[PDB]
Each structure stands twice: as structure tokens, then as C-alpha cells.
Amino acid sequence: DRLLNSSDYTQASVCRECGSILTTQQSVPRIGSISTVCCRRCSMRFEDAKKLIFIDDSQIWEDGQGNKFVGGNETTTVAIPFVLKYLDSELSAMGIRLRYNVEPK
């Protein structure tokens, strides 16, 4: 209650696949479609993915700039202290990667 719930408790997105909480974002959808939660690390630029079977529609997402991506849909939410995000961020500045193993897979 003191060191989490009533302080910096935060529901945050993780990629179950790479175990990051820093490389997720909301997709930007076409009008009428609903936004989904995606991992920038685990997904291919759309071009590069074509360049290597057919690709399903649910597997493509886009950002605000407009680039299309394939994959990176293995996300959920976990409850973490916000300051964890700051620490992870600082660590990645130093070239260091934290990888959270989430369950259920």
C-alpha cells in the first residue's frame, strides 16, 4: 500500500516477446478501426516483411508518421511502480537492457 499502491502504482504495457516496457506504443488506426498495443522492437517495417505465404490483416499496424509494421502483437499489461520505467529508461541510455519475463505466456 505504501511503497506501491499509494505512490507510483502504474498499469503499463509489456511485450511478452522481448520483455520490454519501453518499446510498446498504441497503434494509430484508420478511422473506424480500433487502436491496438504493439511492440516496436519485435515488429518488421512493412517493406522488409514483404521482401520475405500471405500476410494477414490483423498483423499490420501503423504509427502516426505513417510507417506500416508487421507483427509485435504479443503485449499485455502488468502493474509496476512508475519509477521502474525511469530506471529502465536510464539503463537503456547506458546501453543496458532489462528483460521482464511475464506469465502467462
Partner: protein, 48 residues
């Protein structure tokens, strides 16, 4: 000496198993001691 121990962890490719009180506070996990030293499950009827 945060960065020293961190440097050591990285070079060992260490896994934090998250068992110590400190580690669990870091990740926001319920403590292992006391009321956190067991799990609670609900007995539910009508399950077949």
C-alpha cells in the same frame, strides 16, 4: 554502489529471480514474508 553491481549483473547475464524483499519492491511484487508467504485460492462449486 548501484552502477558497480549493475555492471556486474550485466556481465554475468544475471537473472533476478525476484526473491529478496528489495528486488520485489523494485518490481512492485507482493513481499515474500508474512502475509505474502502463501497464496489464496477460492473454492468454487458448479465447475463441471
Amino acid at each position: 554502489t548501484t552502477c558497480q553491481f549493475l555492471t556486474k549483473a550485466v556481465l554475468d547475464n544475471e537473472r533476478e529471480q525476484l526473491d529478496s524483499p528489495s528486488a520485489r519492491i523494485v518490481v512492485g511484487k507482493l513481499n515474500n514474508v508474512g502475509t505474502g508467504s502463501f497464496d489464496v485460492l477460492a473454492k468454487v462449486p458448479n465447475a463441471a
